[model samples]
Each structure stands twice: as C-alpha cells, then as structure tokens.
Target: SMAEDTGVRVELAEEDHGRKSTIALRLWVEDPKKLKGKPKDNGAIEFTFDLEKETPDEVAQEMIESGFFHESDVKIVAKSIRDRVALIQWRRERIWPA
Candidate 1:
C-alpha cells in the first residue's frame, strides 16, 4: 500500500549568497505490515540536510523537470532524499554557509 512506504519532509532554512541555500529534512520509513513482515531495520530512518549551493525548492523543481517523479507525492519523496543528503554532507563536513 502507498501508505506503507517510507516518507520524508524537507524545509529550506534560508537563502544564502543569493545562489547557495540551506535546507533541513527528515526521513521516515514506515513500519511494514505484520502480514508483510518486520522492517529490515528501524521502522523509519530520519535525517537532516543543510545543503549548500542550491535551494531546496530549486532542487525539487529540477527533479520534477527531470521526470524523477510522475506524481506529486513521489516527487516530494525524491526531493527529500536529495535535500537530506546534501544537508547531511554539509553538516558533517562543517562546510561554510555561502
């Protein structure tokens, strides 16, 4: 079922340098149905993204343009993942905000 799949949320913190941008995101992996079986690991995975050099909104737009997601919900999921990765990398590396 669609509701059984993982979910993600993303938010833009602030625009940076008029080009770069920062974003925060969270990942949520839904628990598998008992009939389906237990999840591989955690019920859900959560993470944040403080991406630089691009705006979360822009990334999402690009993904849509690229046809990553044919449906709005699916597109959101892809955007969240992309934003999270970018933000996590920046946070871990202590990259300077543009």
Candidate 2:
C-alpha cells in the first residue's frame, strides 16, 4: 500500500589495515506510520567507522564479506573527516515501476 510513511535505515562495521579502511553497509526498512516514528530510526543501518587507526584496504575487505554490499554496486557519500576515519552517508537507488 506504499505505507504513506516509510523509510530505510542502514548500518555498517569498520575494519582497518595498514593504509586503508573498509566499512560494511547494513540496511533496515521500517514503516514509520506503524510506530509513529517513536523509535526514530534507532536501528543499526546507519553508522560510522573509525579509519584513522585502520587501513582503508582492510575496511574494504571486511565490507565485502559483510554480505550487505554488492561488489559491483555500492556508493558512498563522504561526510566529514575524523582522525583516520571518514564519515560517510550512502544510499542505493532501486528502479521500480510506478
């Protein structure tokens, strides 16, 4: 029914290596109308990883094994820089018929 009020949330794990970092992306879907947004998207789909102390290469590898991301289809939105970790926001576009 489209739910009228629905949203998606995501979370990921952080890994580190010598000179690179990787993050796993996990997602959760919710119907706001059902809970009246009381939870306020407190799930784990959205999270940040610490990379300053880790390597990007390791982080990437862990993300790949996490099973939430497709090797050929992933996009990230860099938000800010914190130590070795780069905060990022991301979304995957789904094509569906209206």
Candidate 3:
C-alpha cells in the first residue's frame, strides 16, 4: 500500500500521472581549451537536451566532487538549472549512468 502510493510503480497505474515530479532539465558543462597556450573557455558544453529522472552519472560526478551533491540533491540541482552550468570542466560521457 505505502510503496505504490509514493514509489515509481505508481506512475504505471491508470489513476496516477507521470511527469508531475520529474522535470525537463536542459543542462550544460564547460570545456577548457588549453591548446592555445592558455586555459580559456570556448563556451559552455551541453550535457543533455532532455531532462533526466536522475543525474546521468557523468554530471553526478561534478556535483559529488564539488562537495555539493547527493541523492536528496538531485531535484535541487535539477530545478536550479534548466540549462545549468558546470562547476568546472565537467564533461558528460556517452556511457550514461543507470
């Protein structure tokens, strides 16, 4: 009874709706170009065009490493940046997290 009410399986039920809590986040990371003999930024690198249920693991590292992210931190990070910026040269890998 309790699990179905608040758990993810609830979404599959006809009485429940999806997308209520989850959101669309347009996120980005930064790239450093040191080839020109200087540490310069070309621009902010994009992570995903779509919002995520959870951090894609690569981006998760950015937050974890920065001493700022946790399981409870996901929504806060997600809400803060729709087209969020990386704290550093946070890069996303093609091998995304589950």
Go through the candidates in order and give the clash count of each: 3, 17, 2
Q: Whole-model lDDT, candidate 1?
A: 0.45
Cα distance off (Å), candidate 1, residue 33: 12
Scored against the true structure, residue 45 in model 3 reaches a CA lDDT of 30
Q: Which candidate number maximizes TM-score? A: 1
Pitting candidate 1 against candidate 3, the one with the higher TM-score is 1
Reference-based lDDT, residue 2, model 2: 16
Model 3 residue runs over 4 Å out of place are 1-61, 83-98
- The TM-score, computed over Cα atoms with residue i paired to residue i, of candidate 1 is 0.32
Q: Write the per-residue lDDT of candidate 1 for residues 1-98, one digit (tens) a residue.
A: 12222444443444333233443433443332311222244433333333545555665565446544334444555655665555555654575553
| TM-scores of the models, in the order given | 0.32, 0.27, 0.21
What are the per-residue Cα lDDT tens digits for candidate 2 across 36-69? 2233344544444543355444544454466543
Worst 10 residues of 3 by lDDT: 4-13
The positional error of residue 34 in candidate 1, measured at the CA in angstroms, is 17
Model 2 off-target regions past 4 Å? 1-43, 46-48, 74-98
The residue-level lDDT of candidate 2 at 51 comes to 39
Instruction: Report lDDT (Cα) of residue 80, candidate 2.
Output: 12
lDDT tens digits, residues 4-95, model 3?
A: 11110101112112234332233222211211122223333333322334444445456446544345544334433422323111223322
